[PDB]
Design an enzyme around this catalytic site. Sequence first.
Site, short mmCIF file in Angstrom:
data_model
loop_
_atom_site.label_atom_id
_atom_site.label_comp_id
_atom_site.label_asym_id
_atom_site.label_seq_id
_atom_site.Cartn_x
_atom_site.Cartn_y
_atom_site.Cartn_z
N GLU A 60 0.77 -1.21 0.00
CA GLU A 60 0.00 0.00 0.00
C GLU A 60 0.81 1.28 0.00
OE1 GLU A 60 -2.86 -0.16 2.95
OE2 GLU A 60 -3.93 1.67 2.40
N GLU A 137 4.35 5.01 11.86
CA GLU A 137 2.88 4.92 11.94
C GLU A 137 2.46 4.04 13.12
OE1 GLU A 137 1.31 4.02 7.89
OE2 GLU A 137 2.04 6.10 7.60
#
Lengths: 446, 49, 22, 419, 33
Positions: A60, A137
């Site tokens: 992604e 993240e």
Amino acid sequence: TATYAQALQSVPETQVSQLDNGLRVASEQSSQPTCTVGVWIDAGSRYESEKNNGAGYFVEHLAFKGTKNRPGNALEKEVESMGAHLNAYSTREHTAYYIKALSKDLPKAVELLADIVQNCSLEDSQIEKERDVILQELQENDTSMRDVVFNYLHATAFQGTPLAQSVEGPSENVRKLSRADLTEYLSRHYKAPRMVLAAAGGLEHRQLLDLAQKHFSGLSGTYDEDAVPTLSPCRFTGSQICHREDGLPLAHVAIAVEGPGWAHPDNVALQVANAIIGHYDCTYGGGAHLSSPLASIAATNKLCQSFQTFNICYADTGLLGAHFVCDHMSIDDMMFVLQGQWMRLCTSATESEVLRGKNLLRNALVSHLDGTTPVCEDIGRSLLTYGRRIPLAEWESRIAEVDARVVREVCSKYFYDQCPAVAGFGPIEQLPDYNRIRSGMFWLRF
Amino acid sequence: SHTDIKVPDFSDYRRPEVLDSTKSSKESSEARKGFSYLVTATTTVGVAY
Amino acid sequence: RNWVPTAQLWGAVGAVGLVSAT
Amino acid sequence: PQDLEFTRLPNGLVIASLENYAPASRIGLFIKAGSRYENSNNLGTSHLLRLASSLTTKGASSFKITRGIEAVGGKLSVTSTRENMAYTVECLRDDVDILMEFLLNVTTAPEFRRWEVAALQPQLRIDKAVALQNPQAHVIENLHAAAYRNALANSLYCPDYRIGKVTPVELHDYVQNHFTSARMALIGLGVSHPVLKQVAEQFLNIRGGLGLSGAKAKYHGGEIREQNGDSLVHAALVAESAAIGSAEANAFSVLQHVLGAGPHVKRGSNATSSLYQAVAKGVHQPFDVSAFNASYSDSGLFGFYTISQAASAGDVIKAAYNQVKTIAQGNLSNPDVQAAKNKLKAGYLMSVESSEGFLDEVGSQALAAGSYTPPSTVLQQIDAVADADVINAAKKFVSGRKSMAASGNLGHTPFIDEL
Amino acid sequence: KRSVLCRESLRGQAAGRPLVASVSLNVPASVRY
């Protein structure tokens, strides 16, 4: 003049079609200006092994940074200069990349998307740049109690299955992840029939179908030897995972009992039942006059900050229940009023009540479909979920079949005497004992 | 960070009927409630006497 | 609603209880 | 199939209607009261009224209103900005009528009861409290307050010291002076205009002239600075924009976009963004920045918004200024303005590709112009901007009285004299 | 509070007609631009 029903029947059907390899082509037409073309691939986080647990999720980040045909900033500069927006979303069962754009931009749009799915120029540099970013993240994900708690719920709901891993992927794998592995992942799971290329708006189906770059196809079996379910049931487990941190201000609890897959008569009836409980926030204008007695009671008695019922649909299993945020001194009353609404639902549903929750569902399910991007999604996802159907107009029919008895018998299968799956993040010190939650599933008194 | 979490091995404590890493427990557990409530039932009935 | 059914089993129970018990 | 239908009455209230195909209808009365309509003595009334929309009114009790809409699965948003106040109403095609009677009592016969309106007061803190968790909200607010002196400066959120003080008369007054005929625009996205106007005519005829509040516009450059302990610092730097719906204006929006950095790509970085390129080269690794553009009826504000770290504050702030200075020094080649434009045009259409967008777009025009300009003509106007024009407007930021607002550790945030 | 440590930042405000639009609905509630 024109009346709800009518409207419904008059909505533009969805055209499903298929390329030689199994490329699925859907589209709803409206002849309007912006379009949202999308490729909805369905190999998610639940196919990942322990290692590649966050393999997909890594792809992604790479999805938009290059294609042998467009190194560096090419992708983006191409999307930008058109004014198109490009999004990647990844679930535990579905990855999905889509483009929002002006309807005359399909030509270059669909070429870009198709390019993106197949050729992804990934260098050592980009892999080592994306590692650092995902490690960051993860660090940020931890700051989120909603996120942290729902992960937990899956973990414990589905202990010891492949589906209980974190889409994001276990920290360290990210470090370790071998560059080869991304390949194998894509190769093996990006092969439609899996994928669907769907789209909604001003386009002509005809063209869409044609416009699909027939470049690579499912390299799979023609017989039953494939038949070994890749989609093997995940074992259902009623556990709790309590993670105390008195250093945090509020309390997050996710309680759910296991439910059905994506396809089931019982599964619309459930929604109508959650319609009734509802979903409430510090900021809801109606507080005390809300009609969901749960709402009313936290409104009135400052019992909670925000709560929300959910029905997490998966192939082989589900997650269904409420989630509430509240003070450290409120956990138990919240839990009480909630389960109490469940119970009273499977034994004392009234036709009026169900009737209102019915209608609500209609609206939630019509209003979401406003806009091009939402409608794309429905189409794409809807074809890996419920297969190719576009049940939209049926819905109101199905929804309409709900006499309160229907809602009540449906409700008891899943809730009544089922072992709830529980997860919270401190201060949970007041969070009920598992045995208490459990007996909260039957009705001798309380 | 919170993702390196793993629920312990519960195999030892769980049982027969629901021990199948890869299969449904919904068509297992129906009875597993009935056996446990059966013990209750008995207990109550004997104590009644 | 479900009360009649449930009140009916609750009425049964009291009955058989007296009858036997007593 | 039928396009919209505007109608200006004797009163001056505009109404529109598109009988759409789909099952969703939404009405939404736009009254012209923004936050700019209060005074030193009135501040915070708009906000309390906005939160006050389910209280008892003449024909409907607060219970009936709430339970009513629930009965049918309907929404009632109340939205507002510095200029306007959109009261939206969404529900199913068959229930418009039950709902529209609600919208009319909420807006037209509100009954602010001493006890019901006291009960709400608290709600203002809670609301404000949640909204002020995004640095964008306090900075952006503090920007308006600094760049304006009188009207547009008054924010959207009640002042801390006025919360429990916002009396019922105040809300009465504010409704009676601002929720009036001349200032309204009915809008439907799935209603009959013939039946809509009947209703309009029956229920929306009330008199009130503008600025019983104190209407007027003025721009004053100032700086409002909030110190925090947070590692990140946000600042805005803005000059008087061009006015609403005028050429200059429109030129600004174009130029905004040449620099304007609102990622079109997830996890993607902008190649197109000049500010971002420019900033990014003299800047650290972690940092984000975007052109800011605001236009209202009598004024505007145009410039940019930074989010840097403690010590980079300045570097990023001047970096971005310097690059916008380059466009005002003439430096701007044609290739980049066309991209920008297409960017804009693609944006506006997408903005309108949704019922809720469309209804906003329509209601908004209603209150500015008096009709509905179609998309096509809109698209034509943006196109008319001249490559130079953009440059020119840019020249204005650089040579226009500055007004800035920050938040965080500000040991490294330029002051006016610093830039 | 949500941690704002990485590249991800992308918040800055500027839409067409609406600017700093805050909504308070009977059910939902929010802050946009």
